[PDB]
Amino acid sequence: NSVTVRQDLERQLGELREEFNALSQEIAMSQLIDLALLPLDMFSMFSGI
């Protein structure tokens, strides 16, 4: 029982776009192709966050 404080406003689309575009820098290739061969799944989508 308490006056409910509010939510936290989810980070906006735009800066999200910019920051994901930024993370493209440190991407390795060999590892990327290796991973891309592997098939993930629904359970293997979210169980790493």
Binding site: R6, D8, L9, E10, R11, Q12, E15, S24, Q25
Partner: protein
């Protein structure tokens, strides 16, 4: 040691590379006009949307331009000073912007057992405190004053009074005497060295009453001095919130200080 000062950098153009804190300062006019008690939390939740995690924004309050003037303090990786415009407080606005926007390294000052001088052009004298009235005298080679008899102070040539903060520049090439209001102020002899990227100024209203160097030839307006007009404080706050990415892009953090004072005291 020296981190590398004498082993120069090597670079290239052929290679393709393709928790921090932020404070605010607002004059009590806003604290008056707001008329709320839960507002700072709203500002927090907003800077969340714009990219700051909770616990990374703090607020500070100053009541006058003159009040905030004495003994500046800085508190975050990035300092944003929201300055109200006025028409009779112009030199104070410029002095505060000069002090906080620019670096200073000074030695203490006395009146007791010396005279003083500037060795070059780019040195200034700073006075801060509760009551700062400054009168000064230059001399000849004869240790004699020209325009002020060395023994009597009432006919001195004053430069400051009825003021809180003053940054004065006197001419090179002669010792000086000063009637500082000692117990009611304090003065230092500082050398400005270079600009800093750890402060920014947003002036609400007014028409660019600012100079960051007292040089008549160079009144260098920078990219950190921003000026918007206001009639409603919430609009000012929001509009600042809307381009905080831009403001962060205009500043840089590698120049922060360890103490919360925007200069460096080295006896």
């Amino acid at each position: 040691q020296n981190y590398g000062i004498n082993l120069p950098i090597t670079g290239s153009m052929d290679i393709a590379y393709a928790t921090s804190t932020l404070c605010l300062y607002y004059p009590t006019e806003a604290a008056t006009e707001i008329n709320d008690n839960s507002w700072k939390d709203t500002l927090s939740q907003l800077f969340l949307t714009k990219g700051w995690p909770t616990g990374s924004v703090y607020f500070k309050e100053y009541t006058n331009i003159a009040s905030f003037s004495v003994d500046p303090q800085l508190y975050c990786d990035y300092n944003v000073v929201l300055m109200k415009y006025d028409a009779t407080l112009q030199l104070d606005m410029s002095e505060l912007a000069d002090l906080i926007l620019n670096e200073w390294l000074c030695n203490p000052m006395d009146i007791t057992l010396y005279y003083y001088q500037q060795t070059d052009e780019a040195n200034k004298w700073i006075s801060m405190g509760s009551s700062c009235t400054i009168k000064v005298c230059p001399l000849n080679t004869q240790t004699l004053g020209i325009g002020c008899l060395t023994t009597d102070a009432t006919t001195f040539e004053e430069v400051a009074t009825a003021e809180k903060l003053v940054i004065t520049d006197v001419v090179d090439g002669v010792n000086h005497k000063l009637d500082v209001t000692t117990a009611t102020c304090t003065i230092r002899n500082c050398k400005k060295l270079g600009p800093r990227e750890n402060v920014a100024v947003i002036q609400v209203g007014g028409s660019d009453i600012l100079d960051i160097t007292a040089d008549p030839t160079t009144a260098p307006q920078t990219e950190r001095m921003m000026r918007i007009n206001w009639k409603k404080w919430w609009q000012v706050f929001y509009t600042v919130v809307d381009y905080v990415d831009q403001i962060i892009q205009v500043m840089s953090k590698r120049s922060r200080s360890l103490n919360s004072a925007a200069f460096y005291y080295r006896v």
